[PDB]
Design a protein around this ligand. Structure first.
Ligand code: HEM
Ligand code: HEM
Ligand SMILES: Cc1cc(N)nc(COc2cccc(OCCCN)c2)c1
Ligand SMILES: Cc1cc(N)nc(COc2cccc(OCCCN)c2)c1
Ligand SMILES: C[C@H](O)[C@H](O)[C@H]1CNc2nc(N)[nH]c(=O)c2N1
Ligand SMILES: C[C@H](O)[C@H](O)[C@H]1CNc2nc(N)[nH]c(=O)c2N1
Ligand SMILES: [Zn+2]
Lengths: 407, 411
C-alpha cells in the first residue's frame, strides 16, 4: 500500500503515500503496462465537488470548520437547483495551480505555485476571447522575461456551448503540402492550416507563418483572429562558433503556450484554458528542429559541419543534434528570452520531487516524458524511479474540435 | 481482445493479440503505473500446468500440436512430476526454452538476433571447478577472437532451493572497485561490495583501475569458490579517439564480452538459477553508462577539460559534447580492433524491423520503452517515437536475490 521509489545514482529511497488518493485510471493493468502509450449529471458531480472542497479547506487549515461546512452546503444546494456550481476565485486559483502540480508529464513543476491566473469566466464572444488571449500573451512574454500564466474561459455547461481554442498552442507555424511533394513549414500543422485556409485565412505560404487563432465561444462556430505581430516574440537561431548557422534561416517563438487541453476542477470542466511558461531548450532543438516529421534539419547541419555521413557509427547525427541545441540556448540567452537547459530543469525537478515527497507524501511523474529527448542518463531524472498516477484537479486531453463540432 | 500501438513519426499502427498469452504480473494496476521501477521450491500442484503450457507452446512451434509425440511427452512429464516432484527437459526443449526467454525479454533491444543463440548444456555439472571449466569454454567460444557469438550456458535447475547453482558475479567479466580510506574510489564504484566479498574469500587484489574480477562460483548449494579467468581469454579494447590524440592517455579500456550471470531462467516452471548469457555490446552501454554515469567511471569532466569546452555553465552543453566524443571513441576503438559492437542508431533501427516482424508473425513483441530507448540521443532514434506494450511471457529471464544475502554458509 505504501510504495518506495529509489534513485539508483544516489541510493536515496522515498516513500509514496499520495498515490492512495488517485482517482482517475492509468491505462495499465496487472497483465499489461501502457506506460509508453501517448493517449490512453447531478449524481456524479457533488462527490467530485466535495472531494475538491475537502482538499481546499484542508490546504488553508480550515478542515471541518464552519466555513468549510457552509460551502459544502452552498455547493450542494446549487447543484441540486442548477445542476452545476460556480467556483469562488480562491478555489479557481487553487484548482489551476494544482492541475499544474498534478501534471505527471511536466518537468517544470518546481514553479507550480507561481502561476498567474486570469479569470476569463465573464467572457461571452470570440472577440472577447481574442482580447483575453492577447493580454495573456503580452503578460506572459513580458519582453522576454517570461512569466507563467493561464487564462480560464467559461466552464462546460451541457456540452453544446463549449468554449474552445481550436489551435493546439497559441503560437505555432503553418504547414503546407507542396505541389513539389515536400512540405513547407511545420509538417505537424498541415491539417490545422487547411482548416484555417478553409475558414478564410489568407495564407502567406512561407516557412514560419504564425497561425491565426481559431476561437469558439459558447459552442458557436469558431472565428479567425490574427495575434498582433508585435506581441509574438521570435528568436533568430545562431550558433556561438559556427558563423554559417544563421544562413539556415531558422527562428523559433519564445512563448510555449498549450491551448488544446481541458482543466478539470472539482468536477467542473474548463475546455478552454490556454496556459504558458517558458521553454526547455530540447523542446525546440531536439524535437522541433530534429524530429523526422518536424523541421528535420540534421542532414543540413551535419553537411555544413562536414561530418562523415557515410555510416551511422561516426555519430554524425549525435554531433549535429548537440550543436543545434547549443545554438537554441545561445540564441535565446543572447536575446534575453527566458529558457532553461535540460540539465538545469531536471536538477530542479529532482529537488521538487524531494520537496513534494517530504511535504505531500508524493509526486506523480511519468518517466517516459520527464527524461529529456537527448543525453537522458547524464541527467539525474534518468536514474530516478517515479510512480505515475492521476490526481485531480488535472489537465486532460480532449478530442480536436473539428471532429466534434456541428457547424 | 486487440491492442493498438502507434508510431508517432511514421503513423504506422500495429495490433497486438500476443498479450492474451501473458501470465506473470507487471506491477502496474489501473491506479498506478510502475513502468520506471527497476525491480518489480515449488509444489507439484503448480508445476504440471506450467509444464503443460510450455510443452503445448513447444509442440505447436514444431507443428506437432496434439500429435502422439506431444501426448506421450505430456504423459511422461506428468508421471515424472508425481513420482519425483520435478522433471527434466529434453535437449531440444532446453534450446527452444532459452531462445524464447531471450525472444520474450522485453528490456532487450538486441532481440533481432534471438534465434541465433548457442546453448551450452551444463546440466551434468556437479562442482564449482566444473562450473569454471564450462564458463571458460563459454567465454572462449563467445569471444571467437573478436567475432562475437551469442551464447548461454545452463547449469542444473533448482531442486529444493537449498542446492542452488549460482554465479555470484553479476557479469562474467567486470572490473574491481576499491573504496579508499579518503572516500574516493579506485576502479569501478559499482563493484565495490562484490570486490570486498572476493578479497574476503581470499582473492589477492592488484588494486588498479581495471582489474578483472575473479569468478565466485557456487555448485549445489555449497560455499562458493574463487577462480581467475585465464587472462588470455579476456579480450579487452584500449579506448582511443579518431581525431583527439590525447584520448588514449586517459588510460581507458573496456572488455569486449558483455555476459550477464545473475539472472534466473524459467522454462516450463523449472528454474535455472545459474544461466550466464552473452552477446555483443551496444556502444552506449560502455560510452554512456560505464564511462559517464556519476556512480561509474565518471570521466565527463576530464574529457570536456581536454576538449577545452566552456565548463562554467551547463547551458554550453559541455557534458553533451564530451558525451558524444566518448561514444565515438568507443565505437572507433572496437571497430579498429575488429571486435563486434553495434551503434545505437543501427541497433534501434534493427529493433523496429524486428518488432514489426514479430507483430506480423507472432501477434506482438512485449517491449519496455524505458529500457529500449538509448541513454543518449533518445528522440533521434526510431524507438523513441514507438508506442510499446509491456507484458510478461514465459519462458523468461527474471531477477533473483543476490546470493550473499541468502546463502547459508557451511564453513
Ligand atoms: C515554467 C516553465 C515550464 C517548463 C520548463 C515546462 C516543461 C515541460 C516540458 C518539457 C513538458 C513536456 C513537453 C513536451 O515534450 O511536449 C511539459 C509538459 C507539460 N507541462 Fe509543463 N513546463 C512549464 C510550465 C508549465 C505550466 C505553467 C503548466 C500549466 C499551468 C504546465 C503543464 C504541463 C502539462 C499539462 C504538460 C503535459 C502536457 C501534455 O501531455 O501534452 N507546464 N512541461
Ligand atoms: C546480441 C547482442 C545483444 C545486444 C546488442 C543486446 C542489447 C541489450 C541492451 C543494450 C540491453 C540493456 C542493457 C543495460 O542497459 O544494462 C539488453 C538487456 C537484456 N538483454 Fe540483450 N542484447 C544482446 C543479446 C542478448 C542475449 C544473447 C540475451 C540472452 C540470451 C539477452 C537478454 C537480455 C536481457 C534478459 C536483458 C535485460 C537485462 C537486465 O534486466 O539486466 N540479450 N540487451
Ligand atoms: C506550458 C509549457 C511549457 C513548456 N516548456 N512546454 C510545454 C509543452 O507541453 C505540451 C503540451 C501539449 C502537447 C505537447 O505535445 C505532445 C502532445 C501531442 N499529442 C506538449 C508547455
Ligand atoms: C547479453 C547482453 C548483451 C548486451 N549488449 N548487454 C547486456 C546487459 O544486460 C544487463 C545485465 C545485468 C545487469 C544490467 O543492468 C543493471 C546493472 C547492475 N549490475 C543489464 C546483456
Ligand atoms: C511513444 C512515446 O510515448 C512518445 O514518443 C513520447 C515519448 N516521450 C515524450 N516525452 C516528451 N517530453 N514529449 C513527447 O512528446 C514524448 N513523446
Ligand atoms: C529508474 C530507471 O528505471 C532506471 O534508471 C533505468 C532507466 N532505463 C534504463 N535502460 C537501460 N537500458 N538500462 C538501465 O539500467 C536503465 N535504468
Ligand atoms: Zn504501467
Amino acid at each position: 500500500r505504501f510504495l518506495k521509489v529509489k534513485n539508483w545514482e544516489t541510493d536515496v529511497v522515498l516513500t509514496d503515500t499520495l498515490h492512495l488518493k488517485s482517482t482517475l485510471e492509468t491505462g495499465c493493468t496487472e497483465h499489461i503496462c501502457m506506460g509508453s502509450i501517448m493517449l490512453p449529471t447531478k449524481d456524479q458531480l457533488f462527490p467530485l465537488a466535495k472531494e475538491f472542497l475537502d482538499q481546499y479547506y484542508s490546504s488553508i487549515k480550515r478542515f471541518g470548520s464552519k466555513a468549510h461546512m457552509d460551502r459544502l452546503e452552498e455547493v450542494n444546494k446549487e447543484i441540486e437547483s442548477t445542476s452545476t456550481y460556480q467556483l469562488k476565485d480562491t478555489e479557481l486559483i487553487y484548482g489551476a495551480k494544482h492541475a499544474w502540480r498534478n501534471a505527471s508529464r511536466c518537468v517544470g513543476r518546481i514553479q507550480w505555485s507561481k502561476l498567474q491566473v486570469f479569470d476569463a469566466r465573464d467572457c461571452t464572444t470570440a472577440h472577447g476571447m481574442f482580447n483575453y488571449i492577447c493580454n495573456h500573451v503580452k503578460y506572459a512574454t513580458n519582453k522576454g522575461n517570461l512569466r507563467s500564466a493561464i487564462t480560464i474561459f467559461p466552464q462546460r455547461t451541457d456540452g453544446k456551448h463549449d468554449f474552445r481554442v481550436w489551435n493546439s498552442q497559441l503560437i505555432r507555424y503553418a504547414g503546407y503540402k507542396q505541389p513539389d511533394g515536400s512540405t513547407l513549414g511545420d509538417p505537424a500543422n498541415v491539417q490545422f492550416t487547411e482548416i484555417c485556409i478553409q475558414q478564410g485565412w489568407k495564407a502567406p505560404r512561407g516557412r514560419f507563418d504564425v497561425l491565426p487563432l481559431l476561437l469558439q465561444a459558447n459552442g458557436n462556430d469558431p472565428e479567425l483572429f490574427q495575434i498582433p505581430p508585435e506581441l509574438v516574440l521570435e528568436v533568430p537561431i545562431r550558433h556561438p562558433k559556427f558563423d554559417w548557422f544563421k544562413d539556415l534561416g531558422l527562428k523559433w517563438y519564445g512563448l510555449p503556450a498549450v491551448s488544446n487541453m481541458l482543466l478539470e476542477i472539482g468536477g467542473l470542466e474548463f475546455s478552454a484554458c490556454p496556459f504558458s511558461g517558458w521553454y526547455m531548450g530540447t523542446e525546440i532543438g531536439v524535437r522541433d528542429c530534429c524530429d523526422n516529421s518536424r523541421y528535420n534539419i540534421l542532414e543540413e547541419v551535419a553537411k555544413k559541419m562536414d561530418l562523415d555521413m557515410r555510416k551511422t557509427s561516426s555519430l554524425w547525427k549525435d554531433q549535429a543534434l548537440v550543436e543545434i541545441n547549443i545554438a537554441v540556448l545561445y540564441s535565446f540567452q543572447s536575446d534575453k528570452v527566458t529558457i532553461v537547459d535540460h540539465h538545469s530543469a531536471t536538477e530542479s525537478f529532482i529537488k521538487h520531487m524531494e520537496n513534494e515527497y517530504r511535504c505531500r507524501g508524493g509526486c506523480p511523474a511519468d518517466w517516459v516524458w520527464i527524461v529529456p529527448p537527448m543525453s537522458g542518463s547524464i541527467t539525474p531524472v534518468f536514474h530516478q524511479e517515479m510512480l505515475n498516477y492521476r490526481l485531480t484537479p488535472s489537465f486532460e486531453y480532449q478530442p480536436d474540435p473539428w471532429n466534434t463540432h456541428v457547424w
